[PDB]
């Protein structure tokens, strides 16, 4: 099985796998049963923004989510990612629906990783920024039901020709290049990610959510990971 670290924007409360009884933001370390959660006042049909930050000095994975005109939600968890993830990873976005559903539309995604060595300075970095997505977006690896180019956006889960979200859908987008998150000479390693999203549903109960994740380079959607598993995990262990 893959190795996954993720920040989840979890729209549906599954209380038997430890979700709180409300939409929430969570930090997931090798399990869908988040290590830490915070209440998230999710707004159906509004564009929101998520930010994720980490560095190897402090060893704290943190995230913040907001909408215009609204207060933010934040969550943090102390974890040494070099003890969880391999030295080379891929980074991605994932989303799912089940019997309950929503659009999982990404309007923008940026990421920056840096490795500073002890050689005079000495800086190594990767940065990408998407503010549109075209039909043939060659620097993304699309998995499952994910598509690019409809209204210039990344649709992680299936949307009907009329714009209605579909149930029982899972999809992911991974950046094409592998990312180097640990190196033996690094004195500080850091990453930051931001994405803007639009979660809409005809229903009072949207599901299931969107996640930013970091994985082994060869990660793939686990079998049966629709719905509450967010396209990330094979089971709820």
> By CB under 8 A, is residue 196 in contact with a copy of itself?
yes
> Could you tell me which residues come within 8 angstroms of residue 103 by beta carbon, excluding any fewer than 6 positions away?
155, 157, 159, 163, 165, 198, 199, 200, 201
How far, in Å, are 28, 98, 132, 199, 231 from residue 228 at the CA level? 13, 7, 28, 16, 8
How far, in Å, are 16, 53, 142, 150, 154 from residue 159 at the CA level? 29, 31, 15, 10, 11
Q: Which is nearer to a copy of itself, 33 or 59 (CB)?
A: 59
**Binding residue for a copy of itself, selected from 15, 83, 120, 237, defined by CB under 8 A:** 120
> By CB under 8 A, is residue 117 in contact with a copy of itself?
yes
Nearest Cα neighbor of 102 from 22, 159, 21, 47 is 159
With CB under 8 A as the contact rule, which of the stretches 23-31, 91-99, 122-130, 162-170 interacts with a copy of itself?
Answer: 122-130
**Binding residue for Mn ion, selected from 4, 6, 9, 10, defined by CB under 5 A:** 10
Q: Which residues of this chain interact with Ca ion, rule CB under 5 A?
A: 10, 12, 14, 19, 228
Q: Which residues of this chain interact with a copy of itself, rule CB under 8 A?
A: 47, 49, 51, 53, 55, 57-58, 60, 62, 64, 66-70, 72, 74, 76, 88, 108, 116-132, 134, 138-139, 152, 175-180, 183, 185, 187-188, 190, 194, 196, 217
């Amino acid at each position: 099985a893959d190795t996954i670290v993720a920040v989840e924007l979890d729209t549906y409360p599954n209380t038997d796998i430890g979700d709180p009884s409300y939409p929430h933001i969570g930090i997931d370390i090798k399990s869908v049963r988040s290590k830490k959660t915070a209440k998230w006042n999710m707004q159906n049909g509004k564009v929101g923004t998520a930010h994720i930050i980490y560095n190897s000095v402090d060893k704290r994975l943190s995230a913040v989510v907001s909408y215009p005109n609204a207060d933010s939600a934040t969550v943090s968890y102390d974890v040494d990612l070099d003890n969880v993830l391999p030295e080379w990873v891929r980074v991605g976005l994932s989303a799912s629906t089940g019997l309950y559903k929503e659009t999982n539309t990404i309007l923008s995604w940026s990421f920056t990783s840096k490795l500073k060595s002890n050689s005079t300075h000495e800086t190594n970095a990767l940065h990408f920024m998407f503010n549109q997505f075209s039909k043939d977006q060659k620097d993304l690896i699309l998995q499952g039901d994910a598509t690019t180019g409809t209204d210039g956006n990344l649709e992680l889960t299936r949307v009907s020709s009329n714009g209605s979200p579909q149930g029982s859908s899972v999809g992911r987008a991974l950046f094409y290049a592998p990312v180097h998150i640990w190196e033996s000479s690094a004195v500080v390693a850091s990453f930051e990610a931001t994405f803007t999203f639009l979660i809409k549903s005809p229903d009072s109960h949207p599901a299931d959510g969107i996640a930013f994740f970091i994985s082994n380079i060869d990660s793939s959607i686990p079998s049966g990971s629709t719905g509450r598993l967010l396209g990330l995990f094979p089971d709820a262990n």
